[PDB]
Amino acid sequence: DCFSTNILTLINGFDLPEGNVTQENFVDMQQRCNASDPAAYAQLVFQTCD
Amino acid sequence: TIEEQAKTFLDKFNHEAEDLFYQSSLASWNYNTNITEENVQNMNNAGDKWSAFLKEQSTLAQMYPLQEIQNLTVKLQLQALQQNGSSVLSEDKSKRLNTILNTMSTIYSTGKVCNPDNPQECLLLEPGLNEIMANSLDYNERLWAWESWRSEVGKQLRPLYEEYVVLKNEMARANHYEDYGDYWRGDYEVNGVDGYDYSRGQLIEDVEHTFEEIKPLYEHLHAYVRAKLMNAYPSYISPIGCLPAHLLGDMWGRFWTNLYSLTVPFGQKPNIDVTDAMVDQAWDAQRIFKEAEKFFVSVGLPNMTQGFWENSMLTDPGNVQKAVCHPTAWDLGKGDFRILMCTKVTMDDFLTAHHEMGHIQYDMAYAAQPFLLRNGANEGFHEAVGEIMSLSAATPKHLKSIGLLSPDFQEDNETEINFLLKQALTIVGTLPFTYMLEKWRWMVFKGEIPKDQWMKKWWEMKREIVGVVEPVPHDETYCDPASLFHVSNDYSFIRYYTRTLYQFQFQEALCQAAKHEGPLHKCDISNSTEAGQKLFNMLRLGKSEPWTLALENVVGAKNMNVRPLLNYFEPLFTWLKDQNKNSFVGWSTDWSPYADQSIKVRISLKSALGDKAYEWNDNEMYLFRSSVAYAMRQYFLKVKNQMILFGEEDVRVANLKPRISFNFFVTAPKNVSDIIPRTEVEKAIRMSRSRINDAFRLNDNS
Amino acid sequence: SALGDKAYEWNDNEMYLFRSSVAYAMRQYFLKVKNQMILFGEEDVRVANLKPRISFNFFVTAPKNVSDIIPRTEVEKAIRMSRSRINDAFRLNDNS
Ligand SMILES: *[C@@H]1O[C@H](CO)[C@@H](O[C@@H]2O[C@H](CO)[C@@H](O)[C@H](O)[C@H]2NC(C)=O)[C@H](O)[C@H]1NC(C)=O
Ligand SMILES: *[C@@H]1O[C@H](CO)[C@@H](O[C@@H]2O[C@H](CO)[C@@H](O)[C@H](O)[C@H]2NC(C)=O)[C@H](O)[C@H]1NC(C)=O
Ligand SMILES: *[C@@H]1O[C@H](CO)[C@@H](O[C@@H]2O[C@H](CO)[C@@H](O)[C@H](O)[C@H]2NC(C)=O)[C@H](O)[C@H]1NC(C)=O
Ligand SMILES: *[C@@H]1O[C@H](CO)[C@@H](O[C@@H]2O[C@H](CO)[C@@H](O)[C@H](O)[C@H]2NC(C)=O)[C@H](O)[C@H]1NC(C)=O
Ligand SMILES: *[C@@H]1O[C@H](CO)[C@@H](O[C@@H]2O[C@H](CO)[C@@H](O)[C@H](O)[C@H]2NC(C)=O)[C@H](O)[C@H]1NC(C)=O
Ligand SMILES: *[C@@H]1O[C@H](CO)[C@@H](O[C@@H]2O[C@H](CO)[C@@H](O)[C@H](O)[C@H]2NC(C)=O)[C@H](O)[C@H]1NC(C)=O
Ligand SMILES: *[C@@H]1O[C@H](CO)[C@@H](O[C@@H]2O[C@H](CO)[C@@H](O)[C@H](O)[C@H]2NC(C)=O)[C@H](O)[C@H]1NC(C)=O
Ligand SMILES: *[C@@H]1O[C@H](CO)[C@@H](O)[C@H](O)[C@H]1NC(C)=O
Ligand SMILES: *[C@@H]1O[C@H](CO)[C@@H](O)[C@H](O)[C@H]1NC(C)=O
């Protein structure tokens, strides 16, 4: 549930299609998102869960 | 080889073309000075005879090569006659393009909009709508006119424009050109000279470079105008946002001149007005032409031929004959030139006389050149000469010299600031618009912009480059740029950029030849033999040589420059910088006039339905708009006890995203200026949310 | 019958919603089968013979052509395709 919350936060932040990000393609899409539009991702509060 | 019969054919063609061009020019002049239908066909078939030479051009496309013509003049004439134009297209496609162009012109010329409450009388564009957009100070009337003209004319003109761009791209590609934009840019292309070359693509970047030196000054002007509008329409413009598009003095925003009455730096002291003194001197509308000709010859220009004085349409007789007298310098040729311009007693006509006589002086200076080379260097020089002539003839010292503007008057600098701002509202308010429009057209022809993102890119560039925001969202069914005269009627728009620069360069160099001391805008040209010789060392060149050489012969530069314009407007720049201590110079590209009352919607189909979830297309958007209209109807009926006919056209939607998230707002049925406040929309959604949800198979979280 | 208690009243706004639903169904059928995009509206759905039983006749026309009537077979096919959505928009199920 924590991972799902993180995915939802990113999706709502950058308005990507709902089914594009998943459990395993999260880090690369996160990197792509900060590279594309910096200084707007910084407003997001990301929590870590392992 | 060959050169021998090439020349011989050029000579024979010139001999057989000059006379019929002369006859056609006489026929057109007689049509224009006296509107009679009986001779219209008499000249129409005459034009057909000139079209005969078109088929003669077919005789120079097969056996005449290109690389073997080493000489310059014969090559220039040959390539000026070699082009096939639109003839390479098939007959069916050619007639399709012709009927498309005619349909677009007719739609623009005879379009009508009218009131939502009295639909019995409608308004055209040229009278009525233009007066509303120029004179009215009402927010609602201006918004209605802007949005209504957009809706009707753009929605009619979109698909014709799509077919037009497809066909024109095909025709240009089949004519050894990359695209149609390349065909348009080919006017400036110069090659085969080894040192003065100018590529078609290079022009693009040059234009961009020039705009980089304009963005500061314009920005300040923009900010100033914003402040002066905040008093006219309070609570409508954000101090840190862009200007609304319908408040800019006219329908499209090409010029900000009509804002002058609202944005006078010092309204207590008026500027120069001399028509009262001109009337007091009681001068007929004949002596001003003689005085202007004397001023023209004082700088060393050749005397004007007697034929212009003997036969011309100078002043309207005032009899039962009613013919249009729009200003025009007719150059029928062979020493026969005329002026067609109705003369009144104003400053405007007095300066238009100088403009037209500069035009004809340019045109007659190079009469010795061949007929095919009897044109200006490019599209920008011909109007630039007239512009510099009128600018030089409008100085207050000139009025003092010519006997007007009585000496008992001190030239205070506040009136100079007023004049500078009035000039800036015209010259500087149009460069971003021209640049953005030509950029949009170039990228549309190039294929960079897909057919489903024309309006998106249009309004993005509008908000980013010009700092102007639309008052209502416009989807892909609109064709706003096609509502311009120059876009629907297939005309080029880049000239108004380059000319606007060229003239100023000239206005420096010539006025430098007169050894000016003070500011540039106060300098004069009259009685400058060196300046006249320098100008004539370009006037007689014509099209025989590349325009770079002609430009260098005057300013010593190989391209267009922006510095003289900034030196022209430096005093106004200093004043504006002084006057904007508190204002936020710049604009933000996120504020919208409708963004306060919008509601955002986010939809998650995959979470709610998982498998067997439907796709989201424009039909689902239609259903959502219908549902919101139903909710608003029910709320207004069951609470406020009023019956209002909301539709799916009253729900305006913006910012659609692949996440399925968008903003929307609601307006009154037949009134675009009336927006339902967000609280009422929230109440209606609260009332009907269960039905809105179950129409789409989603439940309050998706 | 379907809702029993807490059943809503039927006014002209419900007729507007029904016309919008039928227009949506016709749009979807024409887009997804005949490969044409036609802009049907609620003004193209003509309704007659409204009764207190809530029974009425309707037909459909082309968007800007009153002389063009979609034949009953195409309307039947479109209703068959979109009947589930038409039903669940109104809280009724294939028998009410
Ligand atoms: C997202 O971008 C920010 C930029 O603000 C990244 O941070 C900076 O990365 C550089 C390394 O090149 C560091 O020196 C800075 O200290 C970082 N912080 C700044 C400039 O504020 C940040 O790492 C990215 N977010 C992630 C994925 O951690
Ligand atoms: C426009 O100008 C006058 C209108 O006053 C017209 O001139 C006619 O010209 C012919 C040739 O002299 C005369 O025979 C007629 O009597 C004139 N009057 C008529 C018939 O209008 C004419 O309308 C125009 N002039 C032209 C075409 O040359
Ligand atoms: C190229 O052809 C031009 C004409 O198109 C030639 O120019 C003529 O040159 C002769 C002698 O140099 C002069 O008498 C003429 O006045 C020139 N122009 C006319 C009216 O034909 C020229 O000879 C050729 N090449 C050059 C040197 O320009
Ligand atoms: C302008 O039109 C001519 C003829 O209308 C075109 O010439 C054709 O050129 C091609 C390739 O050399 C030949 O194979 C054809 O036989 C020529 N004529 C035909 C039948 O089209 C040419 O497209 C144009 N010429 C230039 C210089 O643009
Ligand atoms: C242009 O005109 C204004 C106002 O006339 C001048 O502003 C000066 O400001 C100082 C400080 O208050 C005052 O002496 C006057 O308001 C103005 N002085 C004079 C001599 O006009 C401004 O200096 C003028 N700029 C010029 C002539 O270049
Ligand atoms: C510029 O040319 C004009 C043409 O003569 C000159 O203007 C005249 O100058 C005399 C000299 O006192 C005045 O009395 C006349 O009234 C002027 N003419 C008019 C129509 O007003 C002027 O002198 C010339 N400038 C130069 C370089 O001498
Ligand atoms: C409106 O609909 C009618 C019939 O659907 C159209 O009339 C037909 O037009 C076609 C093509 O011109 C003819 O072949 C038929 O004979 C016409 N009649 C019928 C009954 O089919 C009419 O063209 C449509 N009008 C518009 C503007 O689309
Ligand atoms: C999912 O991510 C890829 C790469 O970023 C990109 O194609 C797009 O954002 C998404 N894919 C599709 C087909 O939309
Ligand atoms: C030009 O022609 C007119 C004829 O009226 C003459 O008066 C004038 O002196 C001429 N201009 C000159 C010689 O500069």
SS (H, E, C) A1-50: CHHHHHHHHHHHHHCCCCCCCCCCCHHHHHHHHHHHCCCCHHHCCCCCCC
Spell out the residues 6+ positions from residue B305 whose beta carbon is closer than 8 angstroms to its own: B335, B337, B364
CA distance B552 to B195: 13
Using a CB-CB cut-off of 8 Å, the residues of chain B touching C38 are none
Place of tokens 């349909």: B103
Pairing of strands B243-244, B468-469: parallel
Best residue for ligand 1 mutational test, from A26, A30, A34 (most atoms within 8 Å of Cβ): A34
For residues B402 and B291, is the Cβ–Cβ distance under 8 A? yes
Which stretch of DSSP H or E encloses residue B20? helix B3-33
Answer yes or no: is B474 a known binding residue.
no
For residues B488 and B105, is the Cβ–Cβ distance under 8 A? yes
DSSP-derived letter for residue B58 is: G
B576 CA to centre of ligand 5 in angstroms: 15
What is the signed CA dihedral for B293, B296, B302, B305, rounded to 10 degrees?
A: -20
B356 is catalytic: yes
For residues A19 and B616, is the Cβ–Cβ distance under 8 A? no
CA distance C50 to C10: 12
DSSP-derived letter for residue B342 is: -
CA distance B644 to B630: 11
Short-list B279, B421, B298, CA closest to B350: B279
DSSP-derived letter for residue B190 is: B
Largest CA distance in chain A: 27
Q: Which two tokens stand for residue A2?
A: 């924590």
- Residues found in chain A: 50
Q: Which atom of ligand 6 is nearest to the CA of B291?
A: 20
For residues B664 and B631, is the Cβ–Cβ distance under 8 A? no
Q: Which two tokens stand for residue C19?
A: 């016309």
Q: Coil, strand, or helix at residue B325?
A: coil
- Residue B122's beta-bridge partner residues? B114
Cα distances (Å, whole numbers) of residue B336 to B312, B323, B360: 10, 21, 11
Residue B357's Cα: distance from chain center in Å? 24
Cα distances (Å, whole numbers) of residue B580 to B219, B242, B468, B575: 11, 17, 20, 9
Q: Which amino acid is at B100?
A: I
The 3-state secondary structure of chain C, one letter per residue: CCCCCCCCCCCHHHHHHHHHHHHHHHHHHHHHCCCCCCCCCCCCEEEECCCCCCCCEEEEEECCEEEEECCHHHHHHHHHHHHHHHHHHHCCCCCC
Provide the shortest C-alpha distance from residue B625 to chain C (in Å): 10
Burial of A37 (0-12, 13-18, 19+ CB in 10 A): exposed
Answer yes or no: is B355 a known binding residue.
yes
- Residue B329's beta-bridge partner residues? B339
Q: Coil, strand, or helix at residue B68?
A: coil
Pairing of strands C65-69, C57-62: antiparallel
Provide the shortest C-alpha distance from residue C49 to chain B (in Å): 22
Which technique was used to obtain these atomic coordinates? cryo-EM
Compute φ and ψ for B674, nearest 5 degrees: -95, 120
Query: Are the beta carbons of B605 and A18 separated by less than 8 Å?
Result: yes
Sign of CA pseudo-dihedral B129, B132, B135, B140: negative
Compute φ and ψ for B545, nearest 5 degrees: -135, 160
Answer yes or no: is B458 a known binding residue.
yes
Chain B interface test: which of C12, C19, C20 (most B C-beta within 10 Å): C20
Short-list B381, B370, B304, CA closest to B337: B304
Place of tokens 């904007």: B580
- CA angle (B287, B288, B289) in 5-degree steps: 90
The Cβ of residue B58 has, within 10 Å, a number of other Cβ atoms equal to 10
Largest CA distance in chain B: 95
Q: Coil, strand, or helix at residue B347?
A: helix
CA distance B629 to C12: 13
The Cβ of residue B619 has, within 10 Å, a number of other Cβ atoms equal to 21
Burial readout C43-65 (b: 16 or more C-beta within 10 A, e: otherwise): ebbeeeeeeeeeeeeeebbeeee
Whether the CB of C43 sits within 6 Å of ligand 7? no
For residues B116 and B674, is the Cβ–Cβ distance under 8 A? no
For residues B253 and B245, is the Cβ–Cβ distance under 8 A? yes
- Residues found in chain B: 702
Which stretch of DSSP H or E encloses residue B178? none
Short-list B88, B64, B54, B62, CA closest to B9: B64
Answer yes or no: is B516 a known binding residue.
no
In B34-128, where does DSSP find H-type helix? 40-57, 72-82, 91-109
Burial of B601 (0-12, 13-18, 19+ CB in 10 A): middle
CA distance B425 to B409: 26
CA distance C92 to C85: 10
What is the signed CA dihedral for B75, B76, B78, B79, rounded to 10 degrees?
A: 110
- Touching, A vs C (3+ Cβ pairs under 8 A): no
For residues B205 and B223, is the Cβ–Cβ distance under 8 A? no
Compute φ and ψ for C48, nearest 5 degrees: -145, 160
- Residue B241's beta-bridge partner residues? B588
CA distance B134 to B128: 10
Whether the CB of B579 sits within 6 Å of ligand 4? no
Short-list B338, B332, B337, CA closest to B371: B332
B232 CA to centre of ligand 5 in angstroms: 28
CA distance B477 to B36: 43
DSSP-derived letter for residue B402 is: T
Region for B541 from its dihedrals, namely left if φ exceeds 0, alpha if ψ lies in -120 to 50, beta otherwise: alpha
Query: Are the beta carbons of A15 and B659 separated by less than 8 Å?
Result: yes
Using a CB-CB cut-off of 8 Å, the residues of chain B touching C91 are 694
Spell out the residues 6+ positions from residue A40 whose beta carbon is closer than 8 angstroms to its own: A13
Compute φ and ψ for B343, nearest 5 degrees: -105, 125
Which of the ligands is closest to the CA of residue B7? 3
In B514-562, where does DSSP find H-type helix? 529-539, 547-555
Q: Which two tokens stand for residue B581?
A: 């201590």
Short-list B100, B102, B104, CA closest to B153: B104
Q: At what angle do helices B547-555 and B495-513 cross, to 10 degrees?
A: 30
CA distance B441 to B431: 16
Short-list B414, B411, B392, CA closest to B402: B392
Using a CB-CB cut-off of 8 Å, the residues of chain B touching C21 are 623
Compute φ and ψ for C65, nearest 5 degrees: -155, 100
Residue B442's Cα: distance from chain center in Å? 15
Pairing of strands B651-654, B599-602: unpaired
* Residue in B closest to A12 by C-alpha: B659
A12 touches chain B (CB under 8 A): yes
Spell out the residues 6+ positions from residue C50 whose beta carbon is closer than 8 angstroms to its own: C15, C56
Pairing of strands B468-469, B651-654: unpaired
Spell out the residues 6+ positions from residue B181 whose beta carbon is closer than 8 angstroms to its own: B441, B442, B445, B446
For residues C82 and C25, is the Cβ–Cβ distance under 8 A? yes
Cα distances (Å, whole numbers) of residue A36 to A7, B483, B590: 18, 36, 19
Q: Coil, strand, or helix at residue B560?
A: coil
A40 CA to centre of ligand 1 in angstroms: 12
Q: Coil, strand, or helix at residue B333?
A: strand
CA distance B127 to B123: 7
Spell out the residues 6+ positions from residue B377 whose beta carbon is closer than 8 angstroms to its own: B541, B542, B543, B546, B547, B550, B551
Residue B581's Cα: distance from chain center in Å? 33
CA distance C18 to B349: 65
CA distance C58 to B524: 79
Sign of CA pseudo-dihedral C82, C85, C90, C96: positive
Q: Which amino acid is at B280?
A: D
Q: Coil, strand, or helix at residue B548?
A: helix
What is the signed CA dihedral for B171, B173, B179, B182, rounded to 10 degrees?
A: -90
Place of tokens 């000496």: B407
For residues B186 and B192, is the Cβ–Cβ distance under 8 A? no
Sign of CA pseudo-dihedral B73, B74, B77, B80: negative
Short-list B293, B343, B290, B292, CA closest to B315: B343
Rg (CA), chain C: 14
Q: Which two tokens stand for residue B396?
A: 């207050």
Short-list B664, B666, B624, B665, CA closest to B645: B666
Whether the CB of B582 sits within 6 Å of ligand 9? no
For residues B483 and B252, is the Cβ–Cβ distance under 8 A? yes
Question: Would you tell me which residues 354-373 of chain B have a C-beta closer than 8 angstroms to some C-beta of chain A?
Answer: none
The 3-state secondary structure of B435-487, one letter per residue: HHHHHHHHHHHHCCCCCCCHHHHHHHHHHHHHCEECCCCCCCCCCHHHHCHHH
CA distance B393 to B412: 20
Cα distances (Å, whole numbers) of residue B224 to B199, B313, B416, B573: 39, 44, 18, 11
Place of tokens 């390479």: B88
Query: Are the beta carbons of B658 and A19 separated by less than 8 Å?
Result: no
Which stretch of DSSP H or E encloses residue B415? helix B413-427
Question: Would you tell me which residues 19-48 of chain A have a C-beta closer than 8 angstroms to some C-beta of chain B?
Answer: 19
- Residue C61's beta-bridge partner residues? C69
CA distance C53 to A12: 47
Whether the CB of A19 sits within 6 Å of ligand 1? no
Which stretch of DSSP H or E encloses residue B672? strand B671-675
The Cβ of residue A35 has, within 10 Å, a number of other Cβ atoms equal to 9
Query: Are the beta carbons of B648 and C28 separated by less than 8 Å?
Result: no
Residues near ligand 3 with C-beta < 6 Å?
A: B 71, 73-74
For residues B136 and B130, is the Cβ–Cβ distance under 8 A? no
Q: Which two tokens stand for residue B616?
A: 């989201």
Spell out the residues 6+ positions from residue A9 whose beta carbon is closer than 8 angstroms to its own: A44, A45, A46
CA distance B558 to B206: 12
Residues of B with CB under 8 A from a CB of C: 617, 619, 622-623, 626-627, 629-630, 633-634, 637, 647-648, 691, 694-695, 697
CA distance B645 to B652: 16
Q: Which amino acid is at B581?
A: K
CA distance A20 to A41: 18
B486 is catalytic: yes
Q: Looking at beta carbons, which pairs linking B613-620 to residues 24 or more positions away fall under 8 Å?
A: B616/B660, B617/C31, B619/C24, B619/C27, B619/C28, B619/C31, B620/B696
Provide the shortest C-alpha distance from residue A10 to chain B (in Å): 12
Sign of CA pseudo-dihedral B499, B505, B511, B513: negative
Q: Coil, strand, or helix at residue B581?
A: coil
Whether the CB of A48 sits within 6 Å of ligand 8? no
Short-list B548, B561, B591, CA closest to B500: B561
Provide the shortest C-alpha distance from residue C68 to chain B (in Å): 22
For residues B326 and B313, is the Cβ–Cβ distance under 8 A? no
Best residue for ligand 6 mutational test, from B290, B296, B303, B401 (most atoms within 8 Å of Cβ): B401
Compute φ and ψ for B183, nearest 5 degrees: -60, -45
Write the DSSP assignment of B640-671 as a string of letters: S-------TTSEEEE---TTSEEEEEEEETTE
Chain B interface test: which of C11, C12, C17, C92 (most B C-beta within 10 Å): C17
DSSP-derived letter for residue B615 is: P
- Residue B602's beta-bridge partner residues? B661
CA distance B134 to B142: 9
Query: Are the beta carbons of A15 and B658 separated by less than 8 Å?
Result: yes
Write the DSSP assignment of B266-313 as a string of letters: --SS-----HHHHHHHT--TTHHHHHHHHHHHHTTPPPPPHHHHHS-B
CA distance B526 to B579: 35
- Residues found in chain C: 96
* Residue in B closest to C31 by C-alpha: B619
CA distance B433 to B222: 13
DSSP-derived letter for residue B262 is: G
Q: Which two tokens stand for residue C22?
A: 């039928």
Best residue for ligand 4 mutational test, from B84, B86, B170 (most atoms within 8 Å of Cβ): B84
Using a CB-CB cut-off of 8 Å, the residues of chain B touching A11 are 659
- Residue B338's beta-bridge partner residues? B330
B657 touches chain A (CB under 8 A): yes
Residue B311's Cα: distance from chain center in Å? 34
CA distance B481 to B154: 8
